[PDB]
Structure formats: C-alpha cells, structure tokens
Amino acid sequence: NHMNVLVIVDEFYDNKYAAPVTDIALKCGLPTEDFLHPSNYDLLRLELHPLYDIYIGRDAGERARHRAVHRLMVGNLPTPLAPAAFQEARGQQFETATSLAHVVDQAVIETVQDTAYDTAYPAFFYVVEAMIHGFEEKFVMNVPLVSLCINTYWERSGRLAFVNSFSMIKFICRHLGNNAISKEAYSMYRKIYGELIALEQALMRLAGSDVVGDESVGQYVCALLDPNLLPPVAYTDIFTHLLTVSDRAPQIIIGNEVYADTLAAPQFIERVGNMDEMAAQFVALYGYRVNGDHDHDFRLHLGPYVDEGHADVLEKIFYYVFLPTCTNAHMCGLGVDFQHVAQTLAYNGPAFSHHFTRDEDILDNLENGTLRDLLEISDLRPTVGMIRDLSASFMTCPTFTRAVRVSVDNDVTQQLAPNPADKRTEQTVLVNGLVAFAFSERTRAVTQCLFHAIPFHMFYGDPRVAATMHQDVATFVMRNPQQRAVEAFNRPEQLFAEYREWHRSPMGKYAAECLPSLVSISGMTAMHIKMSPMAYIAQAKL
Amino acid sequence: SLAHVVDQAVIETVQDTAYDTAYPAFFYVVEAMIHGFEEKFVMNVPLVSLCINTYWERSGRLAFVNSFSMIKFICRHLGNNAISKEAYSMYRKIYGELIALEQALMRLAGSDVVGDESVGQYVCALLDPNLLPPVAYTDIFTHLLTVS
Amino acid sequence: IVTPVTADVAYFQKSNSPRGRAACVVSCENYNQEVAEGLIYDHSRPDAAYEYRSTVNPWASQLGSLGDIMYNSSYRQTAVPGLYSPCRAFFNKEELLRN
Amino acid sequence: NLLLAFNLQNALKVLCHPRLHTPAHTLNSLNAAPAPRDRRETYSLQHRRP
Amino acid sequence: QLFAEYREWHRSPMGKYAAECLPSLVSISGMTAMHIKMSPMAYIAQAKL
C-alpha cells in the first residue's frame, strides 16, 4: 500500500523464524540421480510439463487447484533435467552456430571478478554513481573527479571501478577516450562494451531476416531482443516507452496504483532533465523534497527516454548474462538516500566556504564527518572544485529510491494458460537505485546512514552481499545458515515473486556455480532464449 | 564446484612464512597487544602497516598470518594504500578462499531443514557451532551457551 | 515423446517401453486396478526394473505428464481423422489396464 | 541383461541406521571376552581438571 | 590438563595428514573432505552429491 522499500525490507527480515524454501529451489538443488529416486516424489509429482512450472497453494475451501506458470526461457528448466554442463555444451554449440567473435579475454573477466569479490571496494564510487544516476549531463559535470577515481583505483589495485552499473560503462567508453584515465582501463571498458555488441550480433544472427507480422521474430526467440524484458536498474522513463512499443499489454504496479496507458503518464511520471526547466523548478522541487509524504506519494520522476540505437538490449545483455556470470551473481541492489549523500558532502567545511580555493587538497581540511572516513577508506584525494561540482547535482537527484513491479503478459504463444492470472510475467525493476558488489564492516559502518540493502532480483539478491550490507538479514542468516545459496534466499514478497519472475532459481544457480570464462558467458546467453515456437524454428535453423 | 580464488604460490608464501626461523617475534608482541580488538586495531594502523611493508620488502613473506583476526582486520581496514598492493591482494586471496570454502560447505547440504535448524550443523563439523576455534579473544562461550 | 536431456543411453539400448516405467500390467494381480495404477502411475515407488530410480523420464510416465496429455487424452474412436498413432499402444490407460 | 547402478543412495536403507551407530553391542562383546588385551594404555584417556 | 586425545575432536590421523601432505590446493580440498561427520545426515548429504 505504501511504496517505501526500506520499511518493506526491514519488516520482512526482522526476526523471521521459519525460512520457507520453495519448490523450484528444492528442484534445482539436488542433482539428476537423486531427483528420479522415489525419495523425492514430492518434487517429482510437480514436474509434468517442461514449459509450465506447476505448483499448489493453501486450501481456502476451493480444493486449492494447481496453477501452472510458464518457464519463459530455457534457463529456467529444472537443473536435474538440464545440468549446467549441458548448458555449457549448448552455449558452445550456439557459439559455433552464430560464430560470435569473443572480444573479451580471460583476463578482463578475471579483473571484473577481482572487483566482484573485493571487500575493499570504496563506497565513494557508489557515492558518485548515485550522484550521476544515469545522466549524460551529470557525467559531464564531473569528468576530472571520475577520472581521478578511475586512475587511483587502477593504480592502487588490479581492479577497475564503476563496472557495477551500465551507465558508468557506457559513459566512460563514450566520454573518457581523452586519456584522462589509463589506457588499460579504457581498453577494458571498451572490451566490455564491444562484447555487448558482439552478443547483440550473436542474437541478431540467432533469428534474423524473418518478420512474423509488423515486427520481426527477434522478440519471439529470446529474452534479450524482446522489449518486454526490462533492465533491472532504471534511470530513464522506460515505462512510458514500454507502454507504447509493447504490442502486448503491460501494467506497471506502483504502490497499488497500477496504470497501463500513456494517457495517465503525466500524473505518474514527472519528466525531469537537461538542467534548465529545473533552473526555474529548483525551489519548488526542493520544497516538494522536504515534505515527508513520499512513502505514500505514488509519483515517480526520471530522466527522458534517450533513443538508443539498440533499444536497451545492451543493458539487458549486460545485467543478464555478463555481470551474474563474472560476479557469480554476487551483487545486490542498494537503496540510496540522495538527501543524505548530499548532506555529507555539501554540509561540510571546505566544501561550503569559498575562501578555500578550487585546486587544493581537502583532506587536511575535512572535519570529523562520515565523508571524511569515506575518503580515508577510499584513499582518494579530491580537490575542492570537483567535490563542489559533485554537490552541484543535488537539485535534480530523486527524493529516495523506489521499486516498481512491471507486469507484462508472456507472449502470443505463451498465453495458452486457462487461468488469466497466470498469463502474466511480472518483474521488479529498481527505479533510480544502484547495484553494488560487496562490502566490509569498515564500509558498512560509514554508509549505515547512506545506503540500504534491497534483495531485489534473482541475480541481485545475494545473501552474502546483503549480510555485509544489512543487519537484520545478517542475524537472519546466522539463525538460518542454509539461506546462503542464492537460489534459496527468501526475498521480500513486495519486491520479488519466484513464480512470477523471468529468471527463477535455476538461472541463479547457473550464475553462482559457473566458473568465470567466455564459455560460461556463451552458455548463459544460451539460457536467455525462449521456449517459444519461433525459438524452436530458429533453433532448428542453426 | 569450488572456485579456488587463492593461488598455488599463495600457499607457497604462507608455507615459507611458516618455515622462516627469522620470523620476528615483535609481530607476536603486537599481536599479543591487540589480541583481536578492532579499537586496538584502529589505534595501531601505522605500526602494522610498517610491519607489512617491512616484511614485504625484506622478504617475500607476509606478516600476521598466524592469526585469523589480523587477516580479518587487514581485509577490513588496511585496503587504503598504506600497505603494499600485492601483499594486500594475497590477503584478499586468503579471505576470499575462506569465503569460498564457506560457500562450498553450505552448498554441500543446503535447502534441507530438519526443524528449526538446518541439517548443516550435522553433516560436517565446521558448520556445527558447537565446535569452537582453537584460539579465542571474545566471549564465544555465552554465545555457544545460548545457541546450543 | 519429449524427455529430459539426462535420460541415460543405457535405457535406450534395451527393449523398453517408450515412457519411463515399464508398465508390466501382466505382472500385477488379476482384475485389480489400484495396484496396476500404482505400478503405472504412482512414482513414489520404484519401477519393475531399475529400483534405484522411479522413471527414466518424468514427462511421459506421470499421470498428468506431457506425453500422457498429447497421446492418452485422445481416445482411438473410429470416425476421427484417424492417423495411426504408435504411442497410443503405449499410452492408452484403458489399453494399459486391459492387460 | 540390464545395467543397474548401485550408488551410495541405494545403500542408505542399511547404512545410516541406529543399529550401525551404537557401540553397546561391541562393548558387550568385548567385556564378555575371556582374554582382553594386555597393553591397556593410560596416557590420554581422560582430561584431569586443573 | 590441555589435550585429552580420546576426548578431543582431531585425533592422530588428521594431524598425520596435516604434517604429511604437501601444501597446495588439492591438499586443502582434501582437508575439507576430512571435516565431514560420519553421521547419518552426512551419509544422506554424500549420497546426494
């Protein structure tokens, strides 16, 4: 009823006694020989259909009939009936078929894996990434600051910064070709960004030169060219674009205020952008920001939908095959308080008075605050001008983060369910949020007042990351240790539904247990392919 | 499917630290002074950074690997360019390898509950919280007494 | 008949039934339907041959299974389209229980 | 002429059973022995409390 | 007063494997195969994997 995600995750995890595991997770845990044993008939009798995942709920007096939701991909097959080595071999067969060019090597995958398990990852990168939150203009307010960040993190370790989010990847690979970083960091960044193009080429050659109607079979063969699948983090108003370009019917659950039309857009989405209508809207938006109705205010504000050349397929491939394989699904979306990260930097001594000149170090002038210890554990040395222009973006960043539950019907060939409630495939999308790698207690003691954890998606709900990020989930996994598999974590129901999700527990298991290589990425791409009729057509082609 | 994040030569360096007759007992002295307290660790950051630097320059060995808690404290605090980079990467190799072993042991017998408690404390020894560390610095005993 | 990918080759070399459990309804007791439906469809007990498992595949031998739907739910009347279906010999529950 | 697999899961009906996890019948078979062992070590049998 | 071997967890053969093995990855992975109980629950977990 109220769209404050922090009280949702806090009151879901506070002293939960029993941690119920679901049928899908118990299915994907055991291997293929223990599955067909008669000792697991309670899981064997709920597997009759390869495409439909049959369950049964609580008897409310109406016999508790079986409901069958669709496993939209091949990746959500039960892993005793489709082991991970089979998916690696199928990805290699697909790699031979479409003949994709691997432009990433082992070493960049090992480098992003080294960033992934880095408990010494500085939270100041997340601070500046929260200050950008997917804006080109905000990225070009602060070029020397982010350049100093990338250079310092590339000399102090073998690790690269800002690979936790797509917007940073695209903005550095576009903007920072001007040698303001090291050449090796830029080469690695464009290796990632060209690997995304190579995967887009592999998918466009998986099913091309066929048009089923007005539109091609690209949305009918795979989860990656399908526009009904959304990126997990959203920084623009992709819901309004979704409501237009979807031939099928999407409905966007925003705090019991669902809307499926673009005619109801201006009373839901507050289009912000390009620094100049805000140049008059400043005092009014700040006065709206200081009123505390936002937990029951049901309005969003985002940047405008830029017309990307690939229809957000790069973000999709990124967050869905790249990061959960090299990180082994060891991410978690964090909810960020944008007023607090501004109150750290702006309400501060040398950042306030203009006696302090632009090009001088700040660390001997920083008073005993949270940002002081943040830059001390980040070992980073900024000047006054870069942090001042960093603080200059407070008047456009949102009030909090939020979370929407984007629902969309499955397909025209996955709509054959008799029950009309199970013809839908919902997906949570973290609007205006931030996805992180992993923390330590030294970081978490600083950003206790700044960030908060969200067990958001199947790939971004790792209890290892939330456990060093959140307290209630830490004592929860202490009282129940078996939750540490990412397929068996009990996520909040207001932000995740394991029977309504696109990616169920088998893709989370394949993400966690795979070894980081190009063969694993080629296998994971062969999981984001539909079990549609047109997908069987295009698979019998190649 | 354990992912050995730690490397073979890390095992060789910690084995060579075990065999060094000139392993200084001053590291044992400062270990005895801190005895696993985080406030005592943040008291003595530059001293232990000097220890890690001097033991990484006078040999290839790494100091303070005699105790879990110093590995935990270096992985926590000393990742801000006060020690040498490659020694810190080896420390993170150790700390990540412990994480990988914990992950593997939980993936041994997980998603299978016998009651209030999972089966994990009965299938191995090291997920049983009744088994205790050899050295102790904090009150693990009343914690055991509550959780037993 | 759709099966999973972990169906072993050792099954498909022996003269088996195409579904998982070899429905040896001759091997059950005379004129009894509950124990024969237990042998055919109840997967809590292992089959006649491979006692270390229930079925070589779960998408054919179960009662609500996929191949059971596409072949058994059709009943071989006379005035149908009437293409010969070979799996009607091995999936028709009336024909299985007739033995 | 089938090719059956006796894995470890088929032996659980006999192995992990409380008859196979009690020492009482072994100690009854040992205390009833007329000729016990003659070495009878006493180095580290029990911990004496200081 | 400290070490009673017939009351302790780690007896002599585990220490023999500790002193006897060569320090590598396969030695560590073999050491965690030795911290498995011979409990019925562990027999279930080992017939699973």
Partner: peptide, 25 residues
C-alpha cells in the same frame, strides 16, 4: 524424533517383479 523421521523420509522407510534378491551391506 525430528531427525529420526527426517532420515526415514530421506530413505525408503515405512514390488511387482520376480521376488528380487535381497541385497545386504
């Protein structure tokens, strides 16, 4: 009791062919 019936559920605790040979361990 819980570990006792948990084990009895994870094993075949409480036939159609040939009076099968009784294996032993």
């Amino acid at each position: 009791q819980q570990v006792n019936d948990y084990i009895k559920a994870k094993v075949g605790a409480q036939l159609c062919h040939g009076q099968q040979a009784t294996c032993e361990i």
